[PDB]
Design a protein around this nucleic acid. Sequence first.
RNA 1: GUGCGCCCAGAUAGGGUGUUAAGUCAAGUAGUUUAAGGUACUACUCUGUAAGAUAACACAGAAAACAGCCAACCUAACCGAAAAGCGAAAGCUGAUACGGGAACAGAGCACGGUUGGAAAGCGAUGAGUUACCUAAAGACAAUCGGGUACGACUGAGUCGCAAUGUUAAUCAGAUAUAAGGUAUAAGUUGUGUUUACUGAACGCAAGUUUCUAAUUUCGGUUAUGUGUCGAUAGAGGAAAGUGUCUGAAACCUCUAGUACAAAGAAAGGUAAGUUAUGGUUGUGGACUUAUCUGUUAUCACCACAUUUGUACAAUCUGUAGGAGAACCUAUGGGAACGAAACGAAAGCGAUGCCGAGAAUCUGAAUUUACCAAGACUUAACACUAACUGGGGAUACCCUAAACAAGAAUGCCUAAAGGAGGAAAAAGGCUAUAGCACUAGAGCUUGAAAAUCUUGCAAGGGUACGGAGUACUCGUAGUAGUCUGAGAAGGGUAACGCCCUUUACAUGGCAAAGGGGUACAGUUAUUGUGUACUAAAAUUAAAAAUUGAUUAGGGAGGAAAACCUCAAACCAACAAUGGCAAUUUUAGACAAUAACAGAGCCGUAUACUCCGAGAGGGGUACGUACGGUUCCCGAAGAGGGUGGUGCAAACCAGUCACAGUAAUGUGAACAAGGCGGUACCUCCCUACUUCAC
RNA 2: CACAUCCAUAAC
Length: 486
Amino acid sequence: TMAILERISKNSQENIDEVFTRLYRYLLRPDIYYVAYQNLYSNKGASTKGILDDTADGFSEEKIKKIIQSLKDGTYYPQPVRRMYIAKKNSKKMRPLGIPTFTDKLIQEAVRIILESIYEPVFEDVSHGFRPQRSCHTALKTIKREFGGARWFVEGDIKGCFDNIDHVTLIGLINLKIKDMKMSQLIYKFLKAGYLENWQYHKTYSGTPQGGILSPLLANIYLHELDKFVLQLKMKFDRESPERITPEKYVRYADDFIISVKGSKEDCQWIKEQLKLFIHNKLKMELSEEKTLITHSSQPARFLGYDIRVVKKRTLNGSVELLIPLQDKIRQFIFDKKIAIQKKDSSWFPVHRKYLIRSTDLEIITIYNSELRGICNYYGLASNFNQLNYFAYLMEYSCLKTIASKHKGTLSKTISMFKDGSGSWGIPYEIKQGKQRRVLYGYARNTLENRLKAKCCELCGTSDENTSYEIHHVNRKTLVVCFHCH
RNA sequence: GUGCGCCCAGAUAGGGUGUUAAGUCAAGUAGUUUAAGGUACUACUCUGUAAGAUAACACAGAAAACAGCCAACCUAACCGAAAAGCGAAAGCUGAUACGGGAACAGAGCACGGUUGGAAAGCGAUGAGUUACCUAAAGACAAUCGGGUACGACUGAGUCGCAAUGUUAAUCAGAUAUAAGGUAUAAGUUGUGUUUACUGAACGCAAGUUUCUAAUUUCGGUUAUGUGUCGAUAGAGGAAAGUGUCUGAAACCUCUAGUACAAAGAAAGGUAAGUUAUGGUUGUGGACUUAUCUGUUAUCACCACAUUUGUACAAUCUGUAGGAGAACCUAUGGGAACGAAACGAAAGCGAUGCCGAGAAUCUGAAUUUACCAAGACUUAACACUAACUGGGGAUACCCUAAACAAGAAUGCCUAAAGGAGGAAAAAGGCUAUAGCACUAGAGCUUGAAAAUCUUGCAAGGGUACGGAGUACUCGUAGUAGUCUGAGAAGGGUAACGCCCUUUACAUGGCAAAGGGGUACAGUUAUUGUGUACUAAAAUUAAAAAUUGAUUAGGGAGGAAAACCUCAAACCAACAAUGGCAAUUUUAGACAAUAACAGAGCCGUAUACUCCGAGAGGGGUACGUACGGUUCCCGAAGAGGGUGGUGCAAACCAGUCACAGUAAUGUGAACAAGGCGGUACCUCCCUACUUCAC
RNA sequence: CACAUCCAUAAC
C-alpha cells in the first residue's frame, strides 16, 4: 500500500515545526490524517479511480505492483514525455493530460496527501481562483464585483509556469515543507522520471504522459507558494491609493494576473520593477512588452473573456464594477468551424454549417446541444444582456438548416412546433428550411432557454424534432419522447 | 445504381430547332393611299389620366392566333394484388375488374381532348378555445367602462398582388476597340493576405470590398418592437371620463417625438439598378432615383416623416497622446489613424469578343410619306437527341430430362426347394402430431414419380455512372477519302484545334458493358530492412568512473513540542564512452485484398431559364474524344459456404429384452444421421435505400 | 434599464 508517505508528512522532524505554516495550524492538523486512512488509502479497489467515468476495473491489487510496493518498483520507471496540449472551447486555459497507463493512475492516490496538506488552510480554491470554495466558476463572478474604486486593470502576456520552467525550483519548493531535514530520501526520486524527448536537454515538464492529472495539481502549488513572499509589498501598497479618490486586491489565475486598486500612474512604476525582480530571480524568465503595457484605460482588448469595464457591445458604467463580454472571443471559434459569415453584405447570418448531409438526425442536434450548454458555466452572468440575444439568432437557424439540407427538397414535409415559445403548437407546412418564425448569478441562464428548451419532452434541457423520436417506454403510461443520452 | 440513359446509321411510328417558296385568321367601328396590306394619318365611340375626389380637352391605348400557369373531370401508359399461359416455376408479359390518376423528374419523347377563369406562397384576417396595463398612488367591484390588430392559438372565410411572354419599321451615315460590363478557370497546402506549387497557361502587383456615418431628447438603448428613468413643457393631479374606499404636495400617462428658413413635402401603380446574398441561376416581397401631361373654377387647411445649408453646447464620442469617476492637447464628429472576414482574390493594364434607348449631329422624308414571318397548317432543304429501330460476350440463381458418377435386396424350411408360397424394411401416394431430421400406418411394393453434389442442352433477371496505361472474348460485315487522321507532317495551342497534300481497299473509329494476366497510387490486416558512408543533435540518459563538497533509513501503528514494537544503504545538480532508432547535412522496403466521382477550361454537337448583346449558373464531370490535379464511400437485409454453444423432439438391435423378420418398448444431450435458435464473419451479387 | 424577436417559394 501507500504507508510510506504516511510516516513522512506526519512526523516531518518537527522540533522546530516545519511544514507550512507553523503558527495557525495545530488543532486542524491531525484532521487530514483521519481522512487519509479510510478515504484515499483507499479500500483498496477495484472500485477506486479510473479514466472511464470514475470506477476502475478489477485487478489483483494492483495487479502485482502493489504487492511489492515498499521495495521501490520500478527503478527508475522511464516512460517518455511527448508534446501534448488540449485546447478548450472557452477560457484559454491549457489543461493537458497524457498517455493512458495503469501505472499513472497509481500515483494519483499519493499526490492527494500533498494537496490536502496545503489546501487547509494555506491553498485556496483548487484550479485557479482566489477565495476557497467547492467549484471553479464561483470565484470568477463574485470577487470581481467587490472592490475597484480606482478603476484600471492589468492584463497578461506570457504564461510563466508551463513554458519556461526552472526545474530545480519546481522541486526545490515542495520539499521545504514535506521533506524532512534528517532521514528523508524517498520523495523526489520519482518526480524526475518524466524526461521529455524533443532533441533537447531538459527534464520536467512538457506533456505530461508521466502524470496526466498530476500536472494541474502541482502547477497551482508552485505558483501560489511563490506569491506568499510577495504579500509583504502588495499589502503595504494599498495605503493612500484607495483613499485618494474616495470619498467622492490581487486575484490570481492560471496564466494571467490582475491588479486592483491602483492610481495613479506614478505609483504603477513599482509594478514593473518589484514584480520583475521576483520573476527574473525565481522563475528566471524575461517579461514580454514590460508586462503588460497599461493602456489606460477602457479599450476593447482581448483578455480571457471577462472585460472589466473601467453594437453588439454596450458601454455600461457607473459606481460599482460589472462585467461586459468582449467581441474578441466570438470572432475566432465561429470562423474556425464556419458557423456564421460576416461580410459579404448585410450583417450576421448562419448557414449551413458544414456539412450538408452527414450523420443521421439525432447526432446532428446533439452537437449543438453540447456546445451551447457549456456557455452557461462561463457566460452565466453579464451586464450586456442585449448581446446574448443577438447571438441566439445565429444558432436557432444553423441547427435547423443542417437538418433540412439532408432531405433537400425532393421528399415530403417536416413536423415541428414553436420553440420561442410554450408551446408546443403550430404545425408549419414547408419543404426546405423556414416557413414563418421557427444580475446575481444569474438571469443570463434564461437566454439558453429561449433557444431550444423542450419540444416537447422536458427532461433535462435538450430537444429534437417530432420526426426523429424513437418509440419506447419510460421503464400517463407512455409518451413519444426522445432517446439518446438517457 | 437518380425511370429511361452505351456505340454506330436516319428524319413525323412518335417530335423539335434554324433557313425559304406560300396559304389561312385577326386590327373597336368608317373613309383616303392601298390591300385578304396595316397601330402612320383624318372623323367618331369606349377605357386609363387619384404624379392631391370630379368636369371641359391633348397623349399613350381598343382584337385575334400561339407559347405558358391552374382548378374540377373520361380513359390508354406505369404498379402492391387479378385473370389467362409457359421446363408447373427461378421469373417475364397487362384487350379487362378493384385502386394514387397533368405519374413523384419534363430539362432531349409529347398522354390527349372539353368545361371553368382559378390554386400552393407572400401581405390584409372572418369564426372558436383564450392572455395584460387602464389616462389619476394602488387594490377591488368578470359593473361591454373601452374594448378585442401589438394578439397567443385551433383552423381558414373574404379582398389586392403571381391573372398575360410575344404582339415587327417614316431613311442612311459619323463621334464606333466612346464613356465599362461578361471572359482568361477548379482543386491541394504555407498563413502576419508572403506571392506557394504539379503536367499553374496567363502577368505586373500591393493591403481591397465593406461598416461605427445625420446630435440643443434615434439622451442612457440592436436589423424589429414594447415598456419606463433623468434634464424641461406641467395642463390633470384622494369624493376617478362606469362604482367605492384609503396615503405623500410628490410621480405616471400625454405634451415643444430640431431653434428655423427654402424647393418635393399623403394613399397606389408602371418602367430600370440594389435588396432575397453563405456554393449559384431564377420565379416573389420591402427601400432610394426617375416616371405616372397643359390650363380654368367651389377645391390647399394641417400638427409630421426627410435632404441641403447655418449656429452652438451637452449627452463624457473616435485615433495618437495625456490625465484626480466629476478631466487634459492636436485633429473635427474615421479627415487611412484601428479591427474582422478575405488565402493568383479585389484594382489596373495588354490581347480578344460584343453593339441598347439607333447618348449627341449632318442630309430628313413626301400621291399623309412605307413595312413581307407574331401564330397555325402544308411543301422542300441542312443538321441533332438518354426517343425509335439493329446488336447479347463476362459472373450467379433455379428447373426439366427413369441422361450419369458417388450406394442396389430385407427371410423361412434346412448349396437346394422357396418370400412367383404369408407378411413387414426400402421407395412411393394423402391427411397430420412436430422447428427440422425420422414418418405412425392402410395400400402399392421386395429397384419405381423429382432425396443431394455436378456436367451437357436450354432459358430468365442484372453488371448499358468518366478513375493513370498496355489487352484477351462478341469484331475490322450493319453506315468503311470520317466528326478521335490515316504516311510524312507547316506553324500555333498543355493535349485538342486549323490548313494543305493524299493510298480506291482486311489503311482508319479496328461499335459500347463487364473480367483476367503485369505494373505508377491509396486504405486496412499481417510481415519485414533494423549503419550502404562521414558528421551534428543525441532517444535508452537506468550502470562503473568522472567529488577529498551539503542533508539522507527500511517493515508498521499513534496528539504539536513525540511516544512504543520487530530488527552501512541510496539519490540529484552533470560529463565521457562504445552499442540499437530517427531527423538534418552529404555521396524505409514486400505479399495479399478492394477501387470511387464531386468538378472546371475548350472544340464539335442537343434542351431549359435570365439578359438588348459577350456569357454564367443546371440538365449522370449534360451525352463522346483529349488533357488534368484533387480524391481511395457507407448502412441494412436475403440466397450459399465455413467455424463454434445451449435447449427440446423423433426414428432402426445406435444399447438392452420378448420376437422369424420388420416392429413394440422403460431408456438418446452414455446423441448415428439432421435441423431450428443464438451467432462473430469469409466470399459473391444493383436484393432493397442513402452519398450525386 | 429592462423584456420579447421577422424574411418565403423554386432549382442541384
